[PDB]
Amino acid sequence: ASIFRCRQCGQTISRRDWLLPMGGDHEHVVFNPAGMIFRVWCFSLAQGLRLIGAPSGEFSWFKGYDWTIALCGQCGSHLGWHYEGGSQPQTFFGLIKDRLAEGPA
């Protein structure tokens, strides 16, 4: 139970080892302006995504960070967001936990 793959297609995305406690916890439950609730797990690093558009600071859940939508690079499923432009760390990923599948390396 140590790597996270895309739930829809199996693309390798991240590792348990790369979980990042932002503000004291790797899990953040949040809502967007359309009222969709996401349970976000923060990772310092990820792979197999495709980051879309240019970063935006609008409604950022994490102070001082701008976001870009992160899709699965294989299937296009929306897996979370890349955050940049902040400090300690400058960048990280916030991935939607129920859109990933955890399993053996």
Ligand X SMILES: O=C1CCCC(=O)N1
Q: For binding to Zn ion (CB under 5 A), which residues are involved?
A: 6, 8-9, 11, 72, 74-75, 77
User: How many helices (DSSP H) and strands (DSSP E) are in the chain?
Assistant: 0, 9
* Residue 77's binding partner out of Zn ion, ligand X, none, with CB under 5 to 8 Å set by partner kind: Zn ion
Q: Would you say 84 or 102 has its CB closer to ligand X?
A: 84
| String of contacts with ligand X for each residue 47-86, x by CB under 6 A | ------------xxx-----x-------------x-----
Can residue 92 be called a binding residue for ligand X (CB under 6 A)?
A: no
Confirm or deny that 25 is annotated as ligand binding.
yes
Hey, what amino acid is at 104? P
- Tell whether 42 is in a known binding site: no
**In the Cβ-directed half-sphere of 46, how many Cα atoms lie within 13 Å?**
32
Q: In what side-by-side order are the strands of the sheet with 37-43? A: 27-31, 37-43, 92-96, 78-84, 66-72, 49-56
What's CA 82's distance to the chain center, in Å? 6
Please give the residue ranges that form the binding site for ligand X (CB under 6 A).
32-33, 59-61, 67, 81
